[PDB]
Design a protein around this ligand. Structure first.
Ligand SMILES: [Mg+2]
Ligand SMILES: [Zn+2]
Lengths: 112, 62, 101, 136, 356, 213
RNA sequence: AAUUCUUGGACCGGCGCAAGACGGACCAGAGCGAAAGCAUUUGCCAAGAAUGUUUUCAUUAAUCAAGAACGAAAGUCGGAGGUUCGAAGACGAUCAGAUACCGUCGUAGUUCCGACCAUAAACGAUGCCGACCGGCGAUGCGGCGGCGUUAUUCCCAUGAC
């Protein structure tokens, strides 16, 4: 296995980030979404996916946010679809702000 | 501890020193899925009831 | 008369293999002559597990196991019934006994 | 005789060193440090016969006296450090190991975390008994 | 049970191991505030009915009122007088023996002020009787089959509503409490009586409790009907075989297959304070004939004896109930939904708009 | 005829800021009767705490040794001493039909602390492998071991003890070595088996009270 | 069981220090060596079989009286060392007896350096060199050809299958 009690994925993910290794911090969260722990949406699955898509943006890996959401939509089917709505809105929200900063950065510091 | 009903589902084999205890697979009337193995004195039949003083302890299968 | 082909031992192309102390005696047997056995055991036997499953502070702490590798000399192995005597035909059977349950 | 921990939830941890030879049993509670001893009741203090110092019974008595003695000082839970003799000798724990660990769980203590701490050598000094072993 | 919409906010989640560990002592006696309806006398002469001397199960036209907390006029009156938790027997029987739950079920909590109206959804499958729920395999058949979970549950509900009336001397002078039935010759034998439970943690509980009939010896009866449809596939033993050498076996086997149904029915009687719960052993004519039925036998059990026998714990039942009433007397107003996970063992709690 | 636990003060133990759960437990001492002092006798006690208990709930197979290098007042202040994998873990990993590769480096942090780190790694059997063995040749083994030493030294050498413990709380060193040695021979069960403490700098308190928040 | 050890605190738990041995598990009918034999890391020194080759010399070869190098363990002499184990010893048991098996101690020895010794069920109980005579599936080292999987993301090219 990898995990018992799927909330521990967040603690390993958080522990790796204090060192500054977001690739293996993402590997941890990726391993939990695709496992036995498919119990129709635990209350802890949102903070896992919120952190997962933050790290997917920070590293720029669209094909991982694909697989991540593709697993999530399955484990949060008609049980609760508000979770999909909150997650994918928060994903595209986070990516929009990275591009806002990226332009203003290049367009005031680097443009000057 | 509350006294609980285990139901004999399939008689397996005979045990003890002098072949005196029938070892039987019981299916709990309380919980849907839990099936344990118990050593039982006297003659026991496929499809009758036992009153277990404890519903957690299990006998060593052979 | 020649009883085994491999003279009761798994040495073929050495000359010398360093000896081992038997775990019942302290008899010196060569490393490959000895009957080896690997016992992976739960620390708490069979029923103790249930009492320590309830009187534990933690939530599904998979209580540890006990790994012990045992070397027996041929006499100690036969006496403890780790091995037994076999037929002239059955002697050549090297496939270890089935452990289905 | 006053561990100032909270009455409701707070568990005070000791650590119990269960040294179980094949002719004696020890049950020995200490600090998490492992320096300051609280209890040590052997298998041999309880029973008065040499042949049953390494008994499941004697180990059951020993763990019961240790449990009762440490409940007064206010040790609620225990970590466990099981060991056989080790070194050149046996690494299977004695027959008192199981009965002792069971006994101080039947006697209303809490079990933290368990581990083997046998002195396993890299490679050791020559074992007692001749080249030809213990012949009987 | 229901398709869950994307506007529905999950607030609290509770799984069956956590709910199994719950307890409450100190639960006080139920106080008969009101006793309503009229109940018939039972013919003890339908117990000279064994495997050899059976009876025709006839269609009896008597009108059953499936009125919830919302549409109860006495509860509507009592609402302002005293009480802050209003329920029916079927609803609290579900929440109490929730631990055995297999299929998807739902309860609408309506917190209007400092109140809990444990209401049920009218025109949803809540007043169906489930069949072979807790077998090695539930019936894996399709809606067009006759041995389907829907069709078996349909006929199981019908034969129960038939049996309760058929066994009864239903045109000999009735036992009247104080009032006529608050819902309306045409009527069915049933009496609704309301009871106060003072519940330790600071909750007052007003539940509607239903007696089916009266028997002499007087005595109050909760009466239900056990169904046997096609034993050989159903994963149970035959009833018609002898039932007389194997009565205890035929009982305990049909119990495990109907673990939740028999648990809801028994805690239903304990709630009402019925001193005896009777049964009705109903099977088909041929193993694939949905229309015909014949009554093989009946056996009577004091629900206190039966609940300790089958399995229940009053502390668990009241310990789970105090937890849920505490949760939803803690969080905000409007419509809620206690829905159990269709495929997994865990109950969930959604917060929903004013509509559905 | 003297109750020997009448003269015993209980002291709360504190772990450094690097762990989630601060307080480890309680510690016994004798009241300052004569010349020998409670706090001075209490200073230099080694506490072997599992990382599961030291964090909230995680791996229980990694243990941290902590020394009460000073006492402030009714409070023992512990500091990172060493680290060790549990017997159960090490015994479970070491299994037959593969190559076990062991390295050790004697490396010093930026501040005084000079550690000895032991790394271990076992040759992984491929997903479509039909060959039973999966052994590494001697030159492949010592190229792996050379790379083990090269990472283990680089990770510690360049930063201080607060950050090396932050690396040992996950197993960032073991994951880095494992990914690095994929070209030579794919390893799988790679950890930093043990951390030892050989030398400490002459004790400071301001340096301790930065580690204790 | 007793001999023995201990309130002049033994055994047990903790932190240190010193010494002299040995290299667990991984370790296999695997590898190397003329045989005896050989296992922690790294460095230095010289050697070696096998494969590869359209290089070189061109019979320089095979086996061997005499003569010669190495030769487990125990044993001997001199020096250093002595942790564990332990022939003789000393007692404690067992037994009819027990000079034995079982137990507690324990000297030579067990370890290293320099000189002798030259035997072992030193075994494959099987001299060395060369040729021919069935099949099959693995295994260790070297070379050669070949779908595809994988690590270097950047894949040529190297490793793992
Ligand atoms: Mg030899
Ligand atoms: Zn032996």
């Amino acid at each position: 296995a990898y995990f018992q009690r799927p909330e521990n994925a967040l603690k390993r993910a958080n522990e790796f980030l204090e060192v500054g290794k977001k690739q293996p911090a993402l590997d941890v969260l990726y391993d939990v979404m695709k496992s036995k722990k498919h119990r129709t949406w635990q209350k802890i699955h949102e903070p896992i996916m919120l952190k997962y898509l933050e790290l997917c943006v920070d590293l720029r890996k669209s094909h991982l946010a694909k697989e991540g959401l593709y697993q999530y939509k399955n484990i949060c089917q008609q049980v609760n679809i508000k979770s999909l709505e909150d997650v994918v809105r928060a994903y595209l929200k986070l990516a929009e702000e990275k591009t806002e900063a990226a332009k203003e950065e290049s367009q005031q510091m680097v443009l000057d | 501890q509350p006294i609980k009903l285990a139901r004999v589902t399939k008689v397996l084999g005979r045990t003890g020193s002098q072949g005196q205890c029938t070892q039987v697979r019981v299916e709990f009337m309380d919980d849907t899925s839990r099936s344990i193995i118990r050593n039982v004195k006297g003659p026991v039949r496929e499809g009758d009831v036992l009153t277990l003083l404890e519903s957690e302890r299990e006998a060593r299968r052979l | 008369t020649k009883k085994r082909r491999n003279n009761g031992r798994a040495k073929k192309g050495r000359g010398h293999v360093q000896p081992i102390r038997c775990t019942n005696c302290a008899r010196c047997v060569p490393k490959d002559k000895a009957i080896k056995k690997f016992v992976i055991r739960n620390i708490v036997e069979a029923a103790a597990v249930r009492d320590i499953s309830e009187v534990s502070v933690f939530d599904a702490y998979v209580l540890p196991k006990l790994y012990v590798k045992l070397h027996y000399c041929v006499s100690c192995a036969i006496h403890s019934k780790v091995v037994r005597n076999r037929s002239r035909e059955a002697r050549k059977d090297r496939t270890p006994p089935p452990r289905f349950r | 005789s006053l561990g100032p921990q909270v009455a409701e939830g707070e568990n005070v941890f000791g650590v119990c060193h269960i040294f179980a030879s094949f002719n004696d049993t020890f049950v020995h509670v200490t600090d998490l440090s492992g320096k300051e001893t609280i209890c040590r009741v052997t298998g041999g203090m309880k029973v008065k016969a040499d042949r049953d110092e390494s008994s499941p019974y004697a180990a059951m008595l020993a763990a019961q006296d240790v449990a009762q003695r440490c409940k007064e000082l206010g040790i609620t839970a225990l970590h466990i450090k099981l060991r056989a003799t080790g070194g050149n000798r046996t690494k299977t724990p004695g027959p008192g190991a199981q009965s002792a660990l069971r006994a101080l769980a039947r006697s209303g203590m809490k079990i933290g975390r368990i581990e083997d701490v046998t002195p396993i050598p890299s490679d050791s000094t020559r074992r007692k008994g001749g080249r030809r072993g213990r012949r009987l | 049970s229901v398709t869950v919409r994307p506007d529905w906010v999950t607030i609290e989640e509770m799984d069956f191991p956590r709910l199994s560990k719950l307890t409450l002592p100190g639960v006080k006696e139920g106080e008969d505030v009101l006793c309503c309806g009229a109940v018939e006398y039972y013919d003890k002469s339908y117990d000279r009915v064994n495997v050899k001397n059976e009876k025709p199960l006839q269609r009896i036209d008597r009108i059953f009122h499936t009125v919830t907390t919302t549409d109860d006029p006495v509860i509507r009156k009592l609402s302002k007088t005293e009480g802050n938790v209003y329920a029916t027997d079927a609803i609290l029987a579900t929440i109490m023996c929730c631990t055995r739950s297999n299929y998807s079920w739902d309860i609408v909590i309506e917190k209007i002020g400092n109140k809990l109206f444990f209401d049920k959804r009218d025109n949803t499958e809540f007043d169906l009787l489930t069949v072979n729920e807790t077998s090695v395999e539930p019936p894996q058949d399709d809606g067009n089959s006759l041995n389907s979970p829907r069709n078996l549950a349909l006929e199981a509900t019908f034969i129960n509503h038939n049996f309760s009336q058929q066994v009864l001397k239903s045109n000999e002078p009735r036992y009247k409490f104080d009032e006529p039935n608050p819902f309306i010759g045409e009527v069915a034998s049933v009496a609704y009586r309301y009871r106060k439970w003072d519940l330790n943690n600071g909750i007052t509980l007003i539940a509607r409790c239903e007696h089916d009939a009266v028997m002499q010896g007087t005595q109050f009866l909760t009466i239900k009907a056990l169904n046997e449809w096609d034993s050989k596939l159903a994963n149970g033993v035959e009833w018609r075989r002898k039932l007389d050498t194997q009565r205890g076996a035929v009982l305990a086997n049909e119990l495990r297959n109907n673990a939740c149904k028999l648990a809801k029915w028994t805690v239903q009687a304990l709630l009402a304070g019925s001193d005896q719960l009777k049964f009705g052993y109903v099977s088909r004519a041929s193993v694939r004939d949905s229309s015909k039925h014949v009554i093989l036998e009946t056996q009577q059990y004091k629900p206190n004896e039966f609940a300790t026998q089958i399995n229940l714990n009053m502390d668990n039942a009241w310990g789970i109930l105090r937890c849920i009433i505490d949760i939803c007397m803690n969080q905000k107003d409007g419509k809620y939904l206690i829905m159990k996970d269709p495929n997994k063992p865990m109950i969930r709690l959604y917060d929903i708009p004013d509509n559905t | 005829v003297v109750d020997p636990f009448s003269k015993k003060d209980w002291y709360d133990v504190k772990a450094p800021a690097m762990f989630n759960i601060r307080n480890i437990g309680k510690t016994l001492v004798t009241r300052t009767q004569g010349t020998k002092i409670a706090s001075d006798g209490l200073k230099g006690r080694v506490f072997e705490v599992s990382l599961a208990d030291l964090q909230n709930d995680e791996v229980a197979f990694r243990k941290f040794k902590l020394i009460t290098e000073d006492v402030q007042g009714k409070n023992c202040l512990t500091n990172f001493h060493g680290m060790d994998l549990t017997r159960d873990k090490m015994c479970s990993m070491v299994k037959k039909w593969q190559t076990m590769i062991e390295a050790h480096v004697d490396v010093k942090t930026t501040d005084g602390y000079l550690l000895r780190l032991f790394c271990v790694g076992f040759t992984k059997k491929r997903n479509n492998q039909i060959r039973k063995t999966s052994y590494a040749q001697h030159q492949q083994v010592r190229q792996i071991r050379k790379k083990m030493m090269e990472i283990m030294t680089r990770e510690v050498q360049t930063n201080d003890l607060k950050e090396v413990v932050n690396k040992l709380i996950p197993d960032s060193i073991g994951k880095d070595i494992e990914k690095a040695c994929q070209s030579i021979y794919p390893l799988h069960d790679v950890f930093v088996r043990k951390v030892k403490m050989l030398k400490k700098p002459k004790f400071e308190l301001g340096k301790l009270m930065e580690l204790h928040g």
